[PDB]
Design a protein around this ligand. Structure first.
Ligand SMILES: COc1cc(C(=O)O)cc([N+](=O)[O-])c1O
Ligand SMILES: COc1cc(C(=O)O)cc([N+](=O)[O-])c1O
Ligand SMILES: [Mn+2]
Ligand SMILES: [Mn+2]
Lengths: 335, 335
């Protein structure tokens, strides 16, 4: 009965895996190298992960069937192609996107897909976004927080967002490990990863985007954040209240809307990795039921608990249907 | 009839003001220098703030009367004595605590006080904590997030927490600007301050404290966080879920409890600067009503809206009384 469309479902492809295996041996100081060595390195602490990410029609599909999940919206897993040099990243994004389109075409009632890009080269990424939207006709876009330790308020990335806005495709900004701007505080206790760094990195990116006025420049942008909006829904009152100080003595630019108004107008959120009925109810209350989507975060999270989380949510059936798949169908162009 | 005890009420004293005035002219690269110049500098963008912080029995007391506020729990305003060298910090802590105690004794039905300390010298700070507890008999302690760009998981600070635990005083960890470990990402759009940086800085300190096992070493510590717990209450499910990964391949130490269990056992929160009924309800639901306290954050926030926020909260009267002042009376030893 309930149509379940999971929105943050990671996948990988062999050309990207190979490039990341090679990257795991370099002296890259990016905090993402912890993940890259753990999953893609020569002595991996997480040896089963590559196979699980690569699999689409085997265990992944069997688990979807066992739990009554209708669809996964697939995305190239963090860190995508963003760790590579511009020419390499650009080349692999085209390849990964073609593979994604093929994967979707093989089972289009069970899989939708997000295309990615290499914002190392904003002009080439703009062209790829156009190809993803018009030729591949994928469902949306995905990028993993920062690129080159810069955030998306940086005017360097304007050609990207111009292309994204024109395409009408929603952009899922998924986490990656904290950038060099902040990674010093995240080297201990596994904080580089999902337990804390992922949220701080991604939420801070998003807040810079809002405060810089990116959404006055590109008002038709749709951004999607996982992990219950990387906690931004919790901070909305304070973001609004302190905005006056920010523009008065803080050097923030004057905006047409309040920060929380940009968040409700331009963002939607998913429940990936936050299987909390209390946090779900809060988000629905402050964002509206049209702005919340269910996700699993497979294979980093197991499907059964995520499915049972939404099936048992203490919300009316019509709101449940919206969160479970109705909103995703609208936002990511799924029939 | 509702007893209102505001728990995050900033004050300052002339010897600290004069030291910060001098500090504002120095080459300090700390991100707190933005605030320090704005408030304590020779050409201050916020020229009225010193007068408002310093005042206790004038405007502050009149505002308390006109809004029916019973008490302010006073704390030396951020950045406290933490920006000074060890010797100066240590000296100014003693002075500020003596002045705090005198301020309280002048109107003890209207003001309570938190003493501070200079963790730059952990051994000397341990001695001042004992003096605050047993000689001055102040109501608790306050410190402003990091010291020397180190967080409180660092073993360097063990003598401080040993002393705090033995004293039985609760420690309010108030924000200050993002430390040098993270400050690069907070130089724009006023993000150094309450709008974003304060929360990220303070919540990251607290998460390091929990994940490092500090509360296994000192299980009787009580920590208080303002700004609705710096959003940690929102992240509880994810902190718990991802902990297994953290201890399995992240190098985090094994803990006796789950991260959220430390947060409920060892932390309480205040509502300073988060006047959201939705966020209040969420926090009460996931932490329990004994763990949430009302505050104003005067003079950085005005009293009337904070007061009306709690007076109109959609919670039962007995829970409202706990939040408004009952919990604070317990946690901070107020009759
Ligand atoms: C590399 O992609 C991810 C890795 C992890 C993890 O290492 O646990 C978690 C998520 N996540 O979204 O929480 C990720 O998508
Ligand atoms: C120096 O202390 C504070 C300053 C500000 C501000 O500059 O707006 C806000 C708060 N606050 O707690 O949100 C502070 O305590
Ligand atoms: Mn993910
Ligand atoms: Mn404050």
């Amino acid at each position: 009965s309930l149509r379940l469309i999971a929105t943050e479902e990671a996948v990988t492809f062999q050309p990207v895996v190979d490039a990341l295996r090679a990257h795991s041996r370099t002296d890259d100081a990016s905090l993402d190298m912890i993940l890259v060595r753990d999953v893609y390195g020569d002595e991996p602490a997480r040896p089963a992960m590559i196979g699980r990410l690569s699999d689409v029609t085997g265990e992944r599909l069997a688990e979807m069937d066992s739990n009554g999940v209708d669809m996964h919206l697939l995305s190239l897993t963090a860190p995508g192609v963003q760790m590579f040099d511009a020419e390499t990243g650009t080349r692999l994004a085209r390849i990964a996107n073609d593979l994604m389109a093929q994967t979707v075409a093989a089972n289009p009632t069970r899989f939708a897909g997000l295309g990615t890009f290499a914002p190392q080269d904003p002009a080439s990424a703009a062209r790829e976004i156009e190809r993803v939207a018009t030729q591949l006709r994928l469902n949306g876009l995905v990028i993993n927080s920062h690129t080159n330790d810069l955030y998306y308020d940086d005017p360097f990335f304007h050609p990207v967002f111009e292309a994204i806005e024109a395409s009408g495709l929603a952009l899922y900004i998924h986490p990656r490990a904290p950038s060099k701007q902040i990674d010093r505080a995240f080297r201990d206790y596994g904080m580089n990863s999902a337990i804390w760094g992922y949220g701080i990195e991604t939420s801070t990116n998003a807040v810079r985007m809002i405060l810089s006025g990116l959404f006055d420049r590109f008002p038709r942008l749709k951004i999607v954040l996982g992990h219950m909006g990387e906690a931004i829904p919790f901070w909305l009152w304070r973001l609004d209240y302190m905005h006056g100080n920010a523009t008065t003595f803080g050097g923030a630019p004057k905006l047409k809307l309040k920060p929380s108004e940009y968040f409700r107008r331009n963002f939607a959120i998913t429940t990936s990795g936050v299987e909390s009925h209390a946090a779900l109810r809060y988000s629905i209350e402050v964002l509206g039921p049209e702005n919340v989507m269910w996700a699993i975060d497979y294979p980093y999270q197991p499907m059964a608990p995520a499915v049972q989380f939404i099936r048992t949510a203490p919300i009316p059936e019509d709101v449940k249907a919206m969160v479970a798949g109705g909103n995703a169908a609208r936002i990511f162009r799924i029939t």
